[PDB]
Ligand binder design. Structure first.
Ligand SMILES: Nc1ncnc2c1ncn2[C@@H]1O[C@H](COP(=O)(O)OP(=O)(O)O)[C@@H](O)[C@H]1O
Ligand SMILES: Nc1ncnc2c1ncn2[C@@H]1O[C@H](COP(=O)(O)OP(=O)(O)O)[C@@H](O)[C@H]1O
Ligand SMILES: Nc1ncnc2c1ncn2[C@@H]1O[C@H](COP(=O)(O)OP(=O)(O)O)[C@@H](O)[C@H]1O
Ligand SMILES: [Mg+2]
Lengths: 525, 526, 527
């Protein structure tokens, strides 16, 4: 080798050698991740070096937390990272297409042909598969019963279908009360809190917000009804001057006059708050809750407790955006223009402690446009099951609202897409005839894996599904209960259009680039 | 223990034919590494770096930068490809193969008891005739034509991995150079490294990637009350902070009275209100600075309906100053009406994959743009970023020197017959190394057929016979099919600045490595 | 952080390496054999330089012959051993031209890399070399100008042996040609099989090469154990048994039963040995040479009847003495010798170079065997002349098998470079490029003669094709001084081993073809 001559500590791989490195590593990630695709998949227990249990079967969490040191396994993990970042689901199915695009192409490159001729057939098959996806998409005008069936498909593939009926009502109803009038839905308006109260099948949808910190004073009210939310960013604690000055006093009686003077600027901010509670007709209960992102000294907490004002401290950055929409007030950074117009409103503000950890709840808002899914999982690993399923389900219903068309379910897309490439296979008119066949057989792994994980036969199921599709016009698919070919558009199994669009584009470019790699080497030491 | 009385401790000495023929084998080794990365039928080469990343590329410069060699003559060839990458865009690989072949024919004459100064003096006479031959076979280019410039950049990206999206990458790379073509005083300059920022975001498809008419940054708004959608903003760029920090002195205040401590904390609030009142006299819409913004400065900009961005980089502030036409000021009380960047189009704080991005686009006449690349992962987006850098610099060479050379083997064989006919009037001992320069240029059409699988005997005989007549003389090697097609029908044209820098660097590399007859290794420095 | 590349399909070696392809196997076998061609290029020709080679046994070998250099260099490259064993077959076949194989096959593989990297693969370079190799064996009978047939005496073979001597001993080309002429012609079998084993070299440390001579007989390095060192009759009785009596082979045991058998046993043993030594003294013998040991009673009667004893511990030296004096080695103890006696002229002893030797000098009947007694200042100089002497003996065996000669010194390789190029231009195929490169391999052989003489080989090789205009066919190289102005080879007398040139082209072409057939190398773990 030439690289061994200049650098003797530099390993290398040749043309027929580096292809066998990438193909055998693609089958290694394929055989692991194919046992957890769909609702009938198997759970995986991931233990790190510390000893924490991470029980999940999502394709992005499996590839990141896996003890693998391989350059080909790191390339698929980069493509799988961007799949779970922009659209959520579609990560486990992303790796199986790459593992089949290199396995089906291995049967032609080893039989005399060149790897570039196979890549010419992948592009000609990707253009026909992209045009076929725009013809099978179904627009249902974003009905709230359609979004239930979209969220039910993404949630059943991550839980044992007893929590999927609970989390569907917590994902669809949370994504509708955010934005209207054809506005882009921001996912930062939904807060994800982890509790430990009752059980895993008790995750409810709080219509307001849930804060992870409580009141830092024992004399404050624990349950406040019909409160005013005053969102602040000021620092009520003692802050020094920027120029280091220091006090200078002569007598001991003049020392206490400087301690009263150094807190006068702090107490002027507190007098702006307690006068706002008197200017809102305080002849009633008239509760006041201050979230107050910056910390508060205990001298001002004792002053606000005597007036009946609940004061929190040390909030988050995005709590000044979610609570501002929920309460309807104005997040202020100063007390120079205080008015009742910047105040919020909530019918019930209460707290609850779970083992020296208080949680402030804000509920009963009119039009919040910001909610909180309250996950109450008993174990630490059960909290990671619901959190990875909520962010998978929220990104699933977000794509079904932004895109006006819904793509069909399990086998209603991949079987019809492979049969559409066979009739256009003699249309390429050249040496790339076998490239369309390798792309059509790689798309058929989605009915093959789902029939294998359900315990049914792999080859006997694909014959009956393709027979019901060719002898009709309906997009028939796979059934995870009986194995018979059933249509996915009628049984309530849907999928996202952007997931299948990006699965045809991210897997095609990453397969045409891996097959054209012949000099895998390690140099730089 | 009595030490041995030696001289020049712990060093090596090597001279004679072991160094003159030793530097040839070190140069032939690097020429065999990137030999399969020249033609349009090239393949990617996956590399591994000690930082932990993966470089999967086929460009000749990015491959040699990740190779750590121990030979001193092998370190010289890596700096040759770095010189070709900084001068032109797509002129690097071709130099390493050509310098390896000009040293391949130079090793034959070193065995014939010929001095290396005789071969170099024949190389300098051959170098001066290759420059004069390319200027005779050139063709003037109309730089105002849009479709003519698309065919030049398509000839440089057919080799690279963006040849599949040729209809998109040609329009992005051409419009990026024509926007940054800035001329203030009487000097035309094209800065595609400081003003043509290539921002890549993992996600989406490659067909949705397009060059924005403006800049973009990965920064959110400072306060949620501020607007995220302004139709026609008045962008004012700042450099200093909007906070109250410690001065560059030894300032210390002696507080004796009670009213003195509360006055200092009020003067810190009034100082922020003084500079915030000075920036709203011009009635802006977007305030962009490079330093921190305090919460008191956000309070005055909230009620004045001003969207503030906090911590934009220094390199991004110089890029938005050319796109919006603003001037970066460092003093809030010295703001003028000419320092406000009017003419900016739609400003929108979009979100791409759980992360906000400030888009300043739709400008009237921007002098800086940002290519928004979107792909499958960070692996292939670094490939398109390195290919667009080789696609924008080959458009810069045409705008500075509008001459084209027929590439694809037609350039190397047109001079190889010119050096052969000119060598008949030598009649000396430098005639035979002069003939080897024309045979060393033939390795570039030799590599175009070894990558596509064509015959190397049946094609070189027919191609050398085509350059015997002076009529056509522009017949090259078609790397796609594998036959001999004229370059006036295919459209493969390379710029003059790429072909001149290829020949000037390949000869002078052979000048440096042939005068080396000794190597001393084992000494330390300070 | 940093990943690595593991095995892919067949990495099952436990510490071994594997080579496949043109760059990893074919081009690396070329560059390894190119270094052996540049190694012995300096020691090629009459102006070649010596090489002090130290082997694993820490002893010194200084020579300019490429055959004994490769025997001491411990080469470990496998394809480099193919060009070493091909040069060893040139030494076993004709004994001269081993340096020609390293230059010609070293230039064949060097120009093969200029064809695989420019065009066609090894399927046409091998077929292109074998076409030009068969045509190279057709010009060699057409380039024969003289013959070693007329007047086979010591005067004519002195000039015919100068070429094999001056290529390794340039200054001693005249004296060594006369010593090799008085020894090779004297052992002629009268138109029969010429044996090279009948010429021995006795290295005597002493004065320079001017005191060397050839003695008709054998010279040993042993003693007498007696006082009969002056023998002029020289009737030699050769025995292979030890001259100490006759003992049995099974056990051997003396059995005494009375006092008459004990006292008479000692006197009976002396009378038994006395009758056997006097049995060879009545036959007229003077020199008795044995192979084994000799008892004290055998030396008592050898000095009594005045016969000289010669001890030869080597058994191969005993067989050469029987071919010297014309005797038969007797396995039994001393018989009455009827007709199997030896007959020499003078057997004596003399201390030459502080070394007492035994000389079986033949005065009148000189031709039975020959021994060249070499004198040198160092022991390393006498080994280099012995290599030059043995190349002169092997040259005389070549002229016995084939009396034809070709003009050497570069005159043959230029005419071979011209005729093969004429076959290459008239070849209507793609294999004509390997034929023209086969003629350029003959061009590098007088190029090595000019580089060793300090002359610019570009001006030397230009004058050779200028004087070979279809009718000369004889001008070689004049390497006696700078500014060559090269002359004829038949007039200077530089012509040697047409049969040596016939096998050297055939062995070096088959060596270069065998390297090019190797496409995949699988080596083991060395120990
Ligand atoms: N109820 C269902 N019936 C049939 N197929 C289903 C059902 N739910 C999910 N699937 C299939 O399982 C596949 C994988 O789903 P999921 O695991 O959520 O995404 P990914 O595998 O990309 O992580 C989908 O392609 C879908 O067709
Ligand atoms: N369609 C084509 N037909 C023939 N030759 C081509 C074609 N496209 C590119 N080439 C050749 O491939 C070569 C690629 O050179 P390249 O490695 O890009 O140089 P650099 O390293 O300086 O960018 C060019 O010299 C060009 O002549
Ligand atoms: N007097 C001379 N003039 C010119 N050349 C000579 C003379 N004597 C010998 N040579 C050259 O020296 C070379 C010695 O070759 P040699 O090393 O003996 O070959 P090998 O190793 O096969 O025996 C011959 O090829 C011959 O041409
Ligand atoms: Mg000789």
């Amino acid at each position: 080798a030439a690289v061994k001559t200049l650098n003797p500590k530099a390993e290398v791989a040749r043309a027929q050698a580096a292809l066998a490195v990438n193909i055998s590593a693609a089958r290694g990630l394929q055989d692991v991740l194919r046992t957890n695709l769909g609702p009938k998949g198997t759970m995986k227990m991931l233990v790190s070096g510390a000893g924490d249990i991470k029980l999940t079967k999502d394709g992005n969490v499996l590839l990141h937390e896996m003890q693998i040191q391989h350059p080909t396994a790191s390339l698929i993990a980069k493509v799988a990272t961007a799949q779970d970042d922009i659209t959520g689901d579609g990560t486990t199915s992303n790796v199986l297409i790459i593992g089949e695009l290199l396995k089906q192409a291995d049967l032609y490159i080893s039989e005399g042909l060149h790897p570039r001729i196979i890549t010419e057939g992948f592009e000609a098959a990707k253009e026909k598969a992209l045009q076929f996806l725009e013809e099978v998409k179904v627009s249902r005008e974003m009905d709230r019963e359609t979004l239930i069936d979209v969220a039910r498909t993404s949630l059943r593939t991550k839980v044992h279908a007893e929590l999927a009926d609970v989390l569907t009502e917590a994902v669809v109803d949370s994504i509708l009360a955010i934005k209207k009038q054809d506005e882009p839905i921001d996912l930062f308006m939904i807060e994800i809190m982890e509790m430990k109260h009752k059980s895993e099948t008790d995750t409810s949808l709080i219509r307001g917000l849930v804060l992870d910190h409580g009141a830092r004073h024992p004399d404050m009210k624990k349950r406040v009804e019909d409160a005013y939310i005053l969102t602040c960013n000021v620092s009520l604690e003692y802050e020094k001057t920027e120029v280091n000055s220091g006090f200078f006093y002569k007598s001991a009686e003049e020392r206490e006059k400087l301690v009263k003077a150094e807190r006068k600027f702090i107490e002027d901010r507190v007098k702006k708050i307690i006068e706002l509670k008197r200017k809102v007709c305080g002849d009633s209960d008239k509760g006041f809750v201050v979230i107050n992102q910056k910390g508060i000294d205990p001298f001002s907490l004792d002053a606000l407790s005597k007036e009946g004002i609940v004061a929190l401290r040390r909030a988050k950055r995005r709590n000044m955006e979610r609570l501002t929409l929920a309460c309807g007030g104005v997040a202020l950074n100063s007390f120079d223009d205080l008015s009742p117009d910047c105040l919020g409103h909530a019918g019930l503000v209460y707290e609850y402690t779970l083992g020296e950890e208080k949680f402030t709840f804000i509920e009963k808002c009119n039009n919040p446009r910001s909610v909180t899914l309250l996950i109450k999982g008993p174990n630490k690993h059960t909290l990671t099951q619901i959190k990875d399923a909520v962010r998978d389900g929220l990104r699933a219903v977000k794509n079904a609202i932004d895109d006006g068309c819904v793509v069909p379910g399990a086998g209603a897309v991949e079987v019809a897409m492979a049969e559409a490439l066979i009739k256009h296979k003699p249309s390429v008119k050249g040496r790339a005839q076998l490239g369309v066949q390798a792309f059509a057989d790689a798309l058929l792994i989605i009915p093959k894996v789902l029939a294998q994980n359900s315990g049914f036969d792999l080859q006997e199921t694909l014959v009956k599904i393709q027979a019901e599709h060719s002898e009709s016009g309906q997009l028939v698919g796979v059934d995870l209960n009986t194995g018979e070919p059933m249509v996915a558009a009628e049984v309530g199994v849907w999928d996202n259009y952007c997931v299948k669009k990006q699965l045809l584009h991210s897997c095609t470019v990453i397969a045409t680039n891996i097959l054209l790699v012949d000099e895998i080497m390690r140099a730089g030491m | 223990h009595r030490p041995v009385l030696v001289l020049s401790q712990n060093t090596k000495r090597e001279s004679g034919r072991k160094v003159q023929s030793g530097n040839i084998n070190a140069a032939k080794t690097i020429a065999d590494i990137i030999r399969t990365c020249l033609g349009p039928k090239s393949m990617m080469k996956m590399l591994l770096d000690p930082m932990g990343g993966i470089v999967m590329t086929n460009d000749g410069n990015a491959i040699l930068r990740e190779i750590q060699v121990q030979h001193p003559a092998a370190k010289s060839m890596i700096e040759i490809s770095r010189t070709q990458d900084e001068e032109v865009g797509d002129g690097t690989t071709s130099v390493i193969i050509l310098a390896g072949e000009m040293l391949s024919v130079a090793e034959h004459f070193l065995e014939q008891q010929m001095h290396p100064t005789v071969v170099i003096s024949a190389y300098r006479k051959a170098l001066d005739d290759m420059i004069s031959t390319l200027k005779k076979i050139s063709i003037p280019v109309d730089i105002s034509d849009s479709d003519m410039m698309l065919n030049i950049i398509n000839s440089s990206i057919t080799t690279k991995a963006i040849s599949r999206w040729s209809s998109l990458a040609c329009n992005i790379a051409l419009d990026a150079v024509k926007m940054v073509q800035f001329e203030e005083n009487g000097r035309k300059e094209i800065d595609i490294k400081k003003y043509a920022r290539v921002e890549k975001i993992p996600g989406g498809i490659i067909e949705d990637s397009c060059v924005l008419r403006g800049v973009m940054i990965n920064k959110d708004v400072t306060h949620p009350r501020m607007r995220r959608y302004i139709k026609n903003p008045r962008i004012v760029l700042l450099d200093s902070s909007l906070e109250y920090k410690k001065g560059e002195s030894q300032t210390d205040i002696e507080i004796t009275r009670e009213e003195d401590f509360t006055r200092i904390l009020q003067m810190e609030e009034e100082y922020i209100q003084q500079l915030c009142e000075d920036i709203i006299q011009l009635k802006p819409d977007v305030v962009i600075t490079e330093k921190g913004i305090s919460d008191l400065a956000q309070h005055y900009l909230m009620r004045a309906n001003i969207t503030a961005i906090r911590r934009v980089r220094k390199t991004d502030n110089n890029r938005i100053a050319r796109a919006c036409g603003a001037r970066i000021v460092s003093r809030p009380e010295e703001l003028r009406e000419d320092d406000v960047g009017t003419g900016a189009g739609l400003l929108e704080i979009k979100k791409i994959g759980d992360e906000y991005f400030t888009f300043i686009t739709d400008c009237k006449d921007p002098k800086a743009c940002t290519i928004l690349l979107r792909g499958a992962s960070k692996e292939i987006l670094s490939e398109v970023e390195r290919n667009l850098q080789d696609a924008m610099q080959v458009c810069r060479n045409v705008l500075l020197d509008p001459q084209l050379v027929p590439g694809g083997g037609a350039s190397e064989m047109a001079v190889a017959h010119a050096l052969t006919e000119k060598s008949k009037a030598m009649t000396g001992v430098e005639q035979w190394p002069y003939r080897a320069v024309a045979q060393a240029l033939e390795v570039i059409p030799r590599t175009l057929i070894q990558n596509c699988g064509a015959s190397t005997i049946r094609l070189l005989t027919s191609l050398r016979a085509k350059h015997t007549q002076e009529n056509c003389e522009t017949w090259g090697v078609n790397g796609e099919t594998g036959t001999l097609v004229d370059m006036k029908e295919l459209g493969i044209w390379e710029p003059l600045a790429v072909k001149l820098q290829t020949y000037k660097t390949a000869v002078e590399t052979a000048v440096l490595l042939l005068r080396i007859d000794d190597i001393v290794s084992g000494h330390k420095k300070k | 952080h940093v990943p690595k590349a593991p095995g892919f399909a067949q990495m099952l070696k436990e510490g071994a390496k594997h080579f496949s392809g043109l760059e990893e196997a074919v081009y690396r076998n070329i560059q390894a054999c190119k270094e052996l061609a540049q190694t012995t290029r300096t020691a090629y020709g009459p102006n070649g330089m010596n090489k002090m080679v130290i082997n694993h046994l820490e002893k010194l070998f200084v020579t300019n012959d490429a055959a004994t250099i490769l025997r001491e260099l411990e080469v470990q490259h496998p394809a480099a051993k193919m060009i070493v064993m091909a040069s060893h077959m040139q030494e076993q076949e004709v004994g001269d031209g081993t340096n020609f194989v390293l230059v010609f096959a070293g230039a064949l593989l060097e120009l093969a890399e200029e064809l695989l990297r420019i065009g066609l693969s090894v399927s046409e370079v091998i077929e292109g070399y074998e076409i030009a190799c068969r045509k190279a064996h057709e010009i060699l009978p057409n380039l024969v100008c003289c013959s070693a047939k007329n007047l086979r005496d010591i005067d004519e073979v002195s000039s015919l042996l100068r070429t094999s001597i001056m290529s390794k001993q340039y200054g001693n080309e005249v004296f060594l040609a006369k010593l090799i002429a008085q020894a090779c012609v004297s052992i002629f079998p009268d138109s029969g099989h010429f044996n090279v084993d009948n010429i021995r070299v006795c290295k005597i440390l002493g004065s320079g090469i001017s005191s060397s001579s050839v003695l008709h007989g054998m010279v040993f390095k042993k003693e007498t154990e007696g006082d009969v060192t002056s023998v002029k009759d020289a009737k030699i009785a050769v025995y292979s048994c030890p001259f100490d009596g006759m003992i049995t082979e099974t056990k051997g045991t003396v059995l005494i039963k009375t006092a008459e058998e004990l006292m008479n046993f000692s006197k009976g043993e002396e009378n038994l040995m006395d009758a056997q030594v006097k049995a060879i003294a009545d036959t007229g013998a003077n020199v008795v040479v044995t192979g084994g040991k000799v008892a004290d009673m055998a030396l008592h009667y050898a000095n009594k009847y005045n016969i000289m004893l010669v001890r030869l511990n080597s058994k191969w030296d005993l067989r050469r003495l029987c071919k010297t004096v014309g005797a038969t080695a007797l396995p039994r103890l001393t018989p009455p010798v009827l007709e199997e006696m030896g007959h020499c002229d003078s057997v004596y002893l003399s201390e030459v170079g502080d070394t007492q030797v035994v000389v079986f000098k033949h005065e009148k009947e000189d031709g039975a065997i020959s021994t060249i007694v070499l004198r040198g200042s160092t022991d390393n100089l006498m080994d280099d002349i012995e290599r030059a002497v043995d190349d002169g003996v092997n040259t005389f065996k070549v002229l016995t098998r084939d009396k034809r000669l070709v003009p050497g010194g570069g005159a043959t390789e230029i005419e071979l470079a011209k005729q093969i190029t004429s076959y290459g231009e008239t070849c209507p195929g793609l294999e004509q490029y390997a034929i023209k490169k086969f003629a350029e391999a003959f061009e590098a052989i007088p190029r090595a003669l000019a580089e060793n003489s300090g002359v610019k080989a570009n001006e030397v090789i230009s004058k050779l094709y200028a004087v070979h205009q279809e009718g000369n066919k004889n001008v070689g190289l004049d390497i006696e001084a700078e500014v060559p102005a090269v002359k004829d080879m038949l007039e200077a007398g530089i012509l040697d081993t047409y049969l040596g040139k016939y096998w050297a082209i055939k062995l070096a072409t088959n060596a270069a073809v065998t390297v090019l057939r190797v496409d995949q190398i699988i080596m083991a773990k060395p120990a």
